[PDB]
Structures are given as structure tokens and as C-alpha cells.
């Protein structure tokens, strides 16, 4: 079991694990509060199991989507931000930390799958999706690919389909309708046909993934590639000039990429609402803490409006915020789980040629709103 007069921050061994430790060494010097950081494995289910008693850690960090899993059952602590706390953060970001109007979190850092390309062979990046296909024919002539990604998750092919006009839930009346899915839409039906015809015309590869796509960029094969916030960590010794740019457009329409924010969590038992709220307010959501963790592990964009500028100094970061602003945040409802499964077989069933485009979206629609 944990004790008082201390702070235990849990990390996924890949997100400011060493940088966060620095902030702790300062806290103790300012007051004397202990600050430990651990990165266990499979702590997803092991976290809420012990959290119920309050013996495990105290503070947790996860996406807004998952943040709505421990509170739904009643295994999280509430909150009470001030005008400066609610003003510093963005309105939309707050929507991610809310179940039924009640607030049980406070977003700090924001992340999202942006476009990472190299300025070695391709100086000018493709602003439109229709411009990539042509490159696939040229870049291939030399003996290299143009752009790849993870073909094992509809989420990766969302900005291409959802962009044309497709969603999972309908945001209305304050909440998101569960009996209203946007899969078999006029736009979505055509969106998929794009990626589909590609693999059919030998424009892409079937054996494509985030890993295989990550190495192709490191070795210097593909000019462009899409990866998460855990890509910058890879580069350090090779020193590869990376470029962050918002996802292209389709038919003159904005992309509909997902949103991935990073908020802090607190237990209802008795972790440290006084120290945690103070450490996260004046030692995490400020240049003193953010810059400290960013120096070792720059998460990228954040919710803090003030820090949004200092970070916006370079378009590389400006593109991150634009991805979340134009993108769409995932609701905090349990129905979202069913969507992860339905959509999974949907895209796969289409690519494999087991079900038509309209059929894949039709069946999935019934599965989600079943």
C-alpha cells in the first residue's frame, strides 16, 4: 500500500519517464515531497484492480478515451479547477474529460498521428491525398515507396474515409447518439473505394504496418510515413530531419483524424489531491514542468494556451494542434468498444474481398447499434 507525503506517477515506459523524474527532485527541494515513478507491464487491468483499495499507485496517465473506463464504474477521484485552470485549457479538450457533464480529469498534453516525411528526396510534401497516388508511380520508378502506414486498424484509414463523410457516432443534444453511426454514408462509401482500388491496382502493399513502416523511414526508403508520438524517441543518433504536417485533404474537404490527449488521473481512495493538484498545476501544466519534461521527451502539443504559443514557435508543433482541432475526439461511452470490433472486420472484410464496401459498413452499423 502507498503512504502519505509522497507522489507516485505511473508511466508506460515511453513518455517522459526520465524527464518526469526531474520535476520530482525539484518538488522535494521546494517542500520535501517524495516523487517516485514506475512503469509496470499490463498495468491496464492491474491498475483499477488495486486502485479500488488504494494500495497501488496514486496518479495515473492515459488517453481521454480510456479515462472514461475507471470513472464509469466508480474507481476515480473528482476534481475542482479554478477560473485560471479552466481558462488555461481549451474548451474542446475539456469535452474529452467528461462523462455526463461531470468533470473527473484535466487534459495537459495533446498528441496525434501526424504526417512525418523526410527532406532528403522529397522536399515538397503532398498537401492533397490525390497527389500521393501519382508519387507512388514515380517514387517507385527509382526503387522506393512514396507513403505507407498501418493497414491493420481502420483508425489509420479514418482521415481518408471519415473525411469524405463518415463517423461512428452523432454528436447531438450534448451527447453522442449511439443509434446513429456514419459508416455507410455517401462519402464513406466512396472513401473506402479509394484505398480499396489502391491495393487492387498494386499501388500499396498488403504486408504494411506501423513497425515495418517505421523502419522504412529510418533506413531511408519511403519519403513519407505516419507514426504516433513515440517516433521521435527513435531518432537521436542518426539525426534525421523530420517534418510534421497535418493530414492532406480529399475533394477540398478537411480530414477527420482521431484525437489523442494526455490527462492526469486521481484515485478516490486517498492518493494526494492536495499535492497532486498542486504538482500538476504548478509543476506540470507550466513552463517549469512542461519544459522540464519536453527537454527529455517532447510530447508535442498541449492543452495549455500559454504553452501552446511557446510550442507553436515552430510549425512542426503547430501541425499537432491543428490535427486535434480539425480531427474528432472519441466519446467516453462503452459503446465505443463495439465500434472498435465492428469497424475492424469491416475494413478487413473489404480489403480481403469477403464483403462489399456497402456491406462492410452496413453490417458494422448494425453491430454498433445492436
Swiss-Prot record:
Primary location group? periplasm
Q: Where in the cell is it found?
A: Periplasm
Source organism superkingdom:
Bacteria
> Which Pfam families does the annotation name?
SBP_bac_1
Gene3D superfamilies per the UniProt record, alphabetical:
Periplasmic binding protein-like II
One GO term describing the cellular component: ATP-binding cassette (ABC) transporter complex
Chloroplast as a keyword of this entry, yes or no, is no
Record keywords: Signal included? yes
- Induction of synthesis: Induced by maltose and the transcriptional regulator MalT. Permanently repressed by cold shock in a PNPase-dependent fashion.
Q: Name one GO biological process term.
A: maltose transport
What InterPro entries does the entry give? Answer: Maltose/Cyclodextrin-bd (IPR006060), SBP (IPR006059), SBP_1_CS (IPR006061)
Q: What does this protein do?
A: Part of the ABC transporter complex MalEFGK involved in maltose/maltodextrin import. Binds maltose and higher maltodextrins such as maltotriose.
Query: What family is this?
Result: Belongs to the bacterial solute-binding protein 1 family.
Q: How does it assemble?
A: The complex is composed of two ATP-binding proteins (MalK), two transmembrane proteins (MalG and MalF) and a solute-binding protein (MalE).
* Protein name, entry field: Maltose/maltodextrin-binding periplasmic protein
The gene it comes from is malE
Amino acid at each position: 500500500k502507498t503512504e502519505e507525503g509522497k507522489l507516485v506517477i505511473w508511466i508506460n515506459g515511453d513518455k517522459g519517464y526520465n524527464g518526469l523524474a526531474e520535476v520530482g527532485k525539484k518538488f522535494e527541494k521546494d517542500t520535501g515531497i517524495k516523487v517516485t515513478v514506475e512503469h509496470p507491464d499490463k498495468l491496464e487491468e492491474k491498475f483499477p484492480q488495486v486502485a479500488a483499495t488504494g494500495d497501488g499507485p496514486d496518479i495515473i496517465f492515459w488517453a481521454h478515451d480510456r479515462f472514461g473506463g475507471y470513472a464509469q464504474s466508480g474507481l476515480l477521484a473528482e476534481i475542482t479547477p479554478d477560473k485560471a485552470f479552466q481558462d488555461k485549457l481549451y474548451p474542446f479538450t475539456w469535452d474529452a474529460v467528461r462523462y455526463n457533464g461531470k468533470l473527473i480529469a484535466y487534459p495537459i498534453a495533446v498528441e496525434a498521428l501526424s504526417l512525418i516525411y523526410n527532406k532528403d528526396l522529397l522536399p515538397n510534401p503532398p498537401k492533397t491525398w490525390e497527389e500521393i497516388p501519382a508519387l507512388d508511380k514515380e517514387l517507385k520508378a527509382k526503387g522506393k515507396s512514396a507513403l505507407m502506414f498501418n493497414l491493420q486498424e481502420p483508425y489509420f484509414t479514418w482521415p481518408l474515409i471519415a473525411a469524405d463523410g463518415g463517423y461512428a457516432f452523432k454528436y447531438e443534444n450534448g451527447k453522442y447518439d449511439i443509434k446513429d453511426v456514419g459508416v455507410d454514408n455517401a462519402g464513406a462509401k466512396a472513401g473506402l473505394t479509394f484505398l480499396v482500388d489502391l491495393i487492387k491496382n498494386k499501388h500499396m502493399n498488403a504486408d504494411t504496418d506501423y513497425s515495418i513502416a517505421e523502419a522504412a523511414f529510418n533506413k531511408g526508403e519511403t519519403a513519407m510515413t505516419i507514426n504516433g508520438p513515440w517516433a521521435w524517441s527513435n531518432i537521436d543518433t542518426s539525426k534525421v530531419n523530420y517534418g510534421v504536417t497535418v493530414l492532406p485533404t480529399f475533394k477540398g474537404q478537411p480530414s477527420k483524424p482521431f484525437v489523442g490527449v494526455l490527462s492526469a488521473g486521481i484515485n478516490a481512495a486517498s492518493p494526494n489531491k492536495e499535492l497532486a493538484k498542486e504538482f500538476l498545476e504548478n509543476y506540470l501544466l507550466t513552463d517549469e514542468g512542461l519544459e522540464a519534461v519536453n527537454k527529455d521527451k517532447p510530447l508535442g502539443a498541449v492543452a495549455l494556451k500559454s504553452y501552446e504559443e511557446e510550442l507553436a514557435k515552430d510549425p512542426r508543433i503547430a501541425a499537432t494542434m491543428e490535427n486535434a482541432q480539425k480531427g474528432e475526439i472519441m466519446p467516453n461511452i462503452p459503446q465505443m468498444s463495439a465500434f472498435w470490433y465492428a469497424v475492424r472486420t469491416a475494413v478487413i472484410n473489404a480489403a480481403s474481398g469477403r464483403q462489399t464496401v456497402d456491406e462492410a459498413l452496413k453490417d458494422a452499423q448494425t453491430r454498433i447499434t445492436k
